Design a protein around this nucleic acid. Structure first.
Lengths: 154, 83, 129, 150, 79
RNA sequence: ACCUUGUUCAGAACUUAAAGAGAAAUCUUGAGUUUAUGGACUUCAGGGGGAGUAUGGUCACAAGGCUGAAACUUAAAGGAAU
RNA sequence: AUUACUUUGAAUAAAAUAAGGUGUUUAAAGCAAAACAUUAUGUUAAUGAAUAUUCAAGCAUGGGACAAUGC
RNA sequence: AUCGAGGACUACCAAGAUUAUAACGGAUAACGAGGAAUUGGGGUUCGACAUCGGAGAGGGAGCUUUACAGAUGGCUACCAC
């Protein structure tokens, strides 16, 4: 009712009707599909109880999570269902035997399951199929951090 | 110094001369004392380097004046060191 | 400001021995400073030391006996791989029998000889002839 | 040395090597807390509160008697001021210099020292925000500090 | 009675034991030392390290007497 | 208070050195602790000219300021001391 | 709790570099030839250098001293 | 639409994306790598060319056959021969 804000009807990838109390398929409702991703990642309660619809959410769709897995800090949360993650690493210059600070920005997809995700939070991301021109990752978990009077939520 | 003394067992006189911080184990040069009042018999305990007017607890024969580093007790105020 | 306490300590010790002083005092004490002295004692470069407790990161007094030519700390502690040992000794030590490096490793703070025996590298602290 | 000028003084205090209360001291924590509690209600800085106890009550170190510092005691009673004491006194001086500067526009040394004072404020405000003492919404402003400091 | 907790170390593997700071070996031994001495108060503390059979010996001596650590309580040597 | 002395903290300096350093003059509250080379950070220099010039950018009411070359030319220019 | 550091590995095209053997008459080469079995037989189902690398990333493993983010 | 993800393209919606840790530009007498020359250690310079990967057939562009080509010792058109 609140997720049907587009011109088309929003449905899950795997939508099936539940059985009524009499034991026959009840066409009057659709089961909320939710799967569990792999290497030690728990499904947030919002992906179970929540009523949002997303075809790119790793918990409620057919997008898989493949080998590559990284981590970083949320940089911007202005775009819809997408965030920018910044990774800070050190690059070793052989001649001077000293490291130098570098950074790279990764555009990752943030499902509506993570509602309390704001700028500056620590986020673990996983790699999936290309979901856009640049979005090729997906948020798997996040931890809140200190505030800076700018609570820019997703 | 070209001539050198023991650095673990400094003499009592040598430690007294040194700055309050540059001793082996730094110690304050101040102390706590009590002052018998000229007016009454009560003894008011106060810091050696007090930074305010010191009054008796009974009355107020003011017993000391703060002067930039040590209390200026009145000439008739007798004190002993609280150990 | 005091960035490296170990650098301050080793400069105090080297300065004392060039003047022929019998014992020297180091104001800030640390675990790393104590470990560096213990390595220097095992090679009999300093007679002994005592640590006074001042409740304020107390002081250390080191007794010297005409044997410590120069002990110096090494600025930023490079990550010394086991294959880079003899490259460092060839640069910092006078010969192949005289001096010894000091390294901080997961097995404690050790000189180059026994760190080679324990088969472990780490950051380099300093040296002494 | 000092932060802003080449002066270098070592005028310090010397805590004795005795973390417990001296033998001659007999007042318990109840009298110390309430005496400190009454002083806080009178609008006295924590630095001055301890001095009054030391000079008058002979309690030179409060941590040696109660086991906790003055600010910790005041926070438990809820009497700790919202603006930290050291930051508050710095904004009191910036206001005072600014007021003098309104009438004396040609004073070029007061403008320099006001700049140094305000730089100190931005250093302390940044630190206290990382220590979560001040909420991130806090911000020092000349048009506002005259009222809160007053 | 006091308890010295286990620590995590970095690679760890495992868990925490809730150490606050009053449960550290340093604090517990200092708390025991002060409580044990009670009337007496400690005003000095010196550790002497020397070579004993190619090994270092940290001879702690609680000084000015006015767990598992062998200590030598004594008065001021010359005061 | 003024003045004469002991100690100690901070400040501008001064004298001696068979010692340390440096090309030497000289420096010693460092210009010392440096081929036995590594305490922390920033700025600047690369033979002499051409030249702080031309052009481009920017600031100024203006004079000017900040940034700032190249072509070509030349075995020296320079520092301290006898 | 991670990261960094460090020790072992996994996995990773050759040629080339280093390096093992081999009398191309030596040598640069080649990876073949034989040493002796007087060799068909036998060494023999003969050699292929372990051929090692290797930095910056990535994966696993033992340690947590020195460090960063812890929270 | 494609063998297929994908603003690859279209319609509607929102204002986002990168940058002093050097984006966007400019130069290269620049194809990248294994490697080569010289080196006490550290390094400096080179690598069109054995082998691996990329791109091209005078200049662009558009296509046919087929499992694989935007093929040129295939075709069509324009420019220069």
């Amino acid at each position: 009712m609140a997720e049907q804000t587009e011109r088309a009807y929003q449905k899950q990838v795997f939508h099936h009707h539940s059985r009524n109390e009499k034991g026959e398929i009840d066409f009057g409702n659709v089961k909320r599909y939710h799967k569990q991703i792999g290497m030690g990642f728990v499904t947030p309660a919002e992906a179970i109880k929540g009523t949002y619809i997303d075809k790119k959410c790793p918990f409620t769709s057919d997008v898989s999570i493949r080998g590559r897995t990284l981590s970083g800090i949320v940089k911007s949360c202005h775009m819809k269902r997408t965030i920018i993650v910044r990774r800070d690493y050190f690059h070793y210059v052989s001649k001077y035997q000293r490291y130098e600070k570098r950074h790279k920005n990764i555009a990752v997809h943030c499902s509506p399951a993570f509602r309390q995700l704001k700028e500056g939070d620590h986020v673990v991301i996983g790699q999936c199929r290309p979901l856009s021109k640049t979005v090729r990752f997906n948020v798997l978990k996040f931890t809140s951090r200190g505030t800076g009077d700018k609570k820019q939520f997703a | 110094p070209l001539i050198e003394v023991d650095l673990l067992n400094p003499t009592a006189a040598s430690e007294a001369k040194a700055h309050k911080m540059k001793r082996l184990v730094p110690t304050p040069n101040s102390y706590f004392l009590e002052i018998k009042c000229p007016k009454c018999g009560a003894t008011t305990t106060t810091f050696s380097h007090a930074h305010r007017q010191i009054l008796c607890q009974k009355c107020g024969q003011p017993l000391g004046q703060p002067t930039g580093g040590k209390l200026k007790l009145t000439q008739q105020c007798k004190f002993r060191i609280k150990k | 400001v005091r960035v490296n306490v170990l650098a301050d300590a080793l400069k105090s010790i080297t300065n004392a021995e060039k003047q022929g002083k019998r014992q020297v005092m180091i104001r800030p004490a640390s675990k790393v400073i104590c470990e560096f002295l213990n390595v220097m004692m095992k090679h009999q470069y300093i007679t002994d030391y005592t640590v006074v407790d001042t409740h304020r990161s107390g002081k250390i007094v080191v007794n010297l006996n005409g044997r410590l030519n120069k002990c110096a700390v090494i600025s930023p502690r490079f990550n010394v791989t086991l294959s880079e040992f003899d490259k460092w000794e060839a640069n910092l030590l006078p010969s192949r029998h005289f001096g010894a490096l000091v390294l901080t490793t997961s097995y404690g703070i050790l000189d180059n000889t026994e760190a080679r025996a324990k088969h472990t590298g780490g950051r380099i602290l300093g040296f002494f002839y | 040395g000092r932060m802003y000028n080449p002066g270098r003084g070592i005028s310090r205090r010397c805590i004795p090597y005795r973390r417990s209360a001296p033998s001659w001291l007999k007042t318990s924590t109840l009298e110390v807390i309430d005496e400190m509690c009454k002083l806080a209600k009178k609008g006295i800085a924590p630095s001055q509160i301890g001095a009054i106890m030391r000079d008058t009550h002979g309690v030179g170190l409060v941590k040696s008697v109660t086991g906790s510092k003055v600010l910790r005691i005041l926070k438990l009673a809820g009497l700790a001021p919202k603006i930290p004491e050291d930051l508050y006194f710095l904004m009191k001086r910036a206001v005072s210099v600014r007021k003098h500067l309104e009438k004396n526009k040609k004073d070029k040394d007061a403008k320099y020292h006001l700049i140094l004072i305000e730089s100190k404020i931005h250093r302390l405000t940044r630190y206290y925000k990382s220590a979560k003492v001040l909420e991130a919404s806090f911000k020092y402003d000349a048009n506002t500090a005259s009222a809160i400091v007053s | 009675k006091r308890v010295v907790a286990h620590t995590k170390k970095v690679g760890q593997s495992g868990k925490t034991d809730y150490k606050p700071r009053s449960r550290t070996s340093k604090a517990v031994h200092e708390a025991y030392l002060n409580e044990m001495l009670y009337p007496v108060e400690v005003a000095g503390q010196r550790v002497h390290a020397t070579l004993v059979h190619k090994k270092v010996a940290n001879s702690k001596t609680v000084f000015v007497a006015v767990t598992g650590e062998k200590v030598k309580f004594a008065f001021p040597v010359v005061a």
